[model samples]
Target chain A: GPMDASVEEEGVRRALDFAVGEYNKASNDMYHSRALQVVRARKQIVAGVNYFLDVEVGRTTCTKTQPNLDNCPFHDQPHLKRKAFCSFQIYAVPWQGTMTLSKSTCQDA
Target chain B: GPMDASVEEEGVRRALDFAVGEYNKASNDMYHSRALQVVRARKQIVAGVNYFLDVEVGRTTCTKTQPNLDNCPFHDQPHLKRKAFCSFQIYAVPWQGTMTLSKSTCQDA
Candidate 1:
């Protein structure tokens, strides 16, 4: 039988919190490493960029499931599957490399 | 074996094409069939809303691994496993229903 909608709603709310928390933690990890640990701020910056890009394209065509090792708007590395701290490993490393970057290769016209 | 980064990058570049192609097809499917031909518009809208939702409580958690629908994500029906077009059935059908917006609900919201 279906759980009461109110109860289910609560569960969903919690689940949503849990998922967002996880994502936020991941984002935090990204900032926590580089310099002053402006985790939340960095996340907001990236989030802003993500939102802007999402709006501009007005669409995305990459819904492939994970282990995706190919495409999915997020980190996806299948070979590293079933390993502990791996999601962090896969997600954070490349990001850290990019965070270390000095500037863009392409110059303004 | 680890492929050369350039080769892999190229592969990734190509793999990206494949993944995007697949997703665009899904979007097109969404667009081509509402009323006379309204599927694409619906997808653009949903994709738009999806972009806004922040996608918390996301769940690639339900993956079946072909003949393996134990707990990655879930589905209702049974006896269907590991086959072509099945993925479409799993993904697209509910999306089609939701496009009409006759009520407040979610896609597979």
Candidate 2:
């Protein structure tokens, strides 16, 4: 049976947030203590076990050692928001259930 | 000055396709020689220098070392399309002109 689109949508967010947290936990050094934000997300039911998630995630990183790592270039000028494209999938099946990061790219902003 | 939305959209696709190709080229070992597909794309101009692109990319990876690396689990079951989240950025300001892969996640599908 197919899950409700809304229900699946919420699940997608939960799964993605957890995955991003795990990534940051392991790569905090690379991110300079910065956290990622979900700018926007879109979804489509590709299959029973797989779903397509095209999401825009945002964050700020500083070159110089600054106290506020959360400060991104877009903070001062909302227009200069650093952005990227993240294309991946959501696995809902119980056995091999998990989120895998496939490919990502970002701008200097 | 901002580029045309349609023009930028096309640029986004071009840059992303190239990036995905580069990824496959370097990670053929992990992908088992599978290629990715673009499911959908959306764009927003955050700033003159920044843009947000949400894209869904699909691909098939095989478990066995079959002659056809293009074989994926979803081949038989179109609904079982494997998917992942790949959030990244595109830099086209001339100097630091390039695409940067930031974060990505996927499902077994």
RMSD of each: 23.9, 21.5
Instruction: State the lDDT of candidate 1 residue by residue for B30-61, as single tens digits.
Output: 21111111111100111111101123122222
Candidate 2 lDDT by residue in tens digits, A68-88: 332334323576434444453
Query: Alpha-carbon error at B69 in model 1, in Å?
Result: 23
DockQ for each model: 0.02, 0.03
Give one digit per residue, the lDDT tens place, for model 1 in A1-109: 1121231343333333333333434442221111111111101112100100001111212332324333223213543111111000010113323211111111111
Give the TM-score comparing model 1 with the true structure, all chains together: 0.14
Please state the CAPRI-style docking class of candidate 2.
Answer: incorrect
- As a whole number from 0 to 100, the lDDT of residue B52 in candidate 2 is 27
Candidate 2: DockQ?
A: 0.03
Worst 10 residues of 1 chain B by lDDT: B83-92
> What does candidate 2's lDDT look like per residue over B37-58, in tens digits?
2435433222112222233333
Residue B23, model 1: lDDT of 33
lDDT computed for candidate 2: 0.34
